[PDB]
Homo-oligomer: A and B are copies of this chain.
């Protein structure tokens, strides 16, 4: 009975195989068949290639030895190599052209999701080329999806020597019969088979996967589109910045490149961006996913004034100062979306680009009190219920699991009405004691929000809604201004509070505004439609930021 799946890198998890390049070069340069491939394996287990794969020497040390072997091979079959022939050039292009075989990775992901131990076993080299980062990036993207990465050059062993196979089984802590081993090389498959492992010769991916699903009893082909990679909180780099004596800001950080600051809404967490963090980091960005003031591991002072937009923005500017960041792209959702428009209006020099999910930019009305404005729209009734200190705190803090289960629902799910909340006497008055689990969240993810909210509760989060007059007065100072830096407004079709039509006049204040629209998407944009959020943000980031 199987419980472990092992995959080769070249020709299995990564395509095209860096092996089929010697053949391609021979054909392209009208060279004798197998000429370059012979020079590659010259001397068998004692030759340059075996020493390279065992980690005795590095790739840059192997390059001149492979070149020598290429000449000695051309000498025997009495032929001549083109004057411009370069092994480095051939390998640089081959490695660079080699990409992840996505359906193979999807299959490995699915097997691991069903309780399988997954491993990459590969004959590889110590890459010291000036262009080594390309493959380093590829190994990083691949490895985090597996339990083990066994590299020949790191272990000093090589396929097909049987010591690497016994090493593999020892790291797996499994008997060969419990192991599937996928390889594109027949000779490297053989020792795994003669040990009693289930084996698959990988030519085309589809056939290999049909064999893989027939042998495991798990559907791997024609499976629904998977969700993007999520975050395991304990596997993240956690950052902490003191923005003032009593205020510390917590953030999760992933990636390299331009700084992208993610600002969640109410009542959320850095974890609300779990599906965006790995995707945006993979797209070449330095992701800084915040626990906004009043949330999770960030400080939560009790005072209402501590949560007005002016202080929140100033604190975010200090956060940039302390991290040594002259700018960051600011991406917000809900209350975070509102902060992010105010960062752009008051601190444009600190904002590389501004993006908002669901939250529109609506200039303050200087001829009307904000309380009047909120009352003029039935959907903003929840904001009036949030005004009285302690009332919403008691209801929201009573049963944390019920709070998040009731709040975090997709549009098709029996969502709370944000209409007549004051009259009804609360948010969950017509809601069950034991809400069903939404398809957007697992029980474990709900328990993360529960644990996070146990520290400070809902006072600080609710205080974001308790500065309407203060924020209105501050916003009125910006009435003559326009947002002229790169900006993205993402609308969610089925958000019945932050409705897409509320964003219709934004071009009057943001003329160069770019847009995105997510159909069949509720209020919780990031978890409702993660794939499309990532697609819209990456595309906008690569074009404008």
Interface residues of A, Cβ cutoff 8 Å to B? 51, 55-58, 60-61, 126-128, 132-133, 135-137, 139-140, 143-144, 154, 156, 234-242, 253-256, 258-259, 278, 281, 286-287, 321-327, 346, 348-350, 352, 477-478, 480-485
Bound CA span A135–B140, Å: 36
Please judge, given known A-B contacts A156-B477, A348-B58, whether A321 and B144 are in contact too, CB under 8 Å.
yes
A259 cross-chain contacts in B, Cβ below 8 A:
256
A349 cross-chain contacts in B, Cβ below 8 A:
126-128, 132-133, 135-136, 139
Nearest CB in chain B to that of A135: its residue:
B349
Copies of the protein in its oligomer: 2
A327 cross-chain contacts in B, Cβ below 8 A:
133, 136
Contact B254 A136 (CB under 8 A): no
A-B contact pairs, 8 of them (CB 8 A): A60-B482, A61-B482, A133-B352, A144-B321, A156-B477, A238-B239, A253-B323, A255-B324
Bound CA span A58–B140, Å: 43
Contact B326 A235 (CB under 8 A): no
A352 cross-chain contacts in B, Cβ below 8 A:
133
Contact A350 B136 (CB under 8 A): yes
Contact B239 A324 (CB under 8 A): no
Contact B235 A238 (CB under 8 A): no
Nearest CB in chain B to that of A280: its residue:
B324
Contact B350 A126 (CB under 8 A): no
Interface centre among A56, A236, A256, A482 (most CB of B within 10 A): A256
Please judge, given known A-B contacts A349-B133, A481-B61, A484-B61, whether A323 and B239 are in contact too, CB under 8 Å.
no
Nearest CB in chain B to that of A61: its residue:
B482
Bound CA span A51–B481, Å: 10
Contact A143 B55 (CB under 8 A): no
A483 cross-chain contacts in B, Cβ below 8 A:
128
A229 to nearest B CB, angstroms? 11
Nearest CB in chain B to that of A287: its residue:
B324
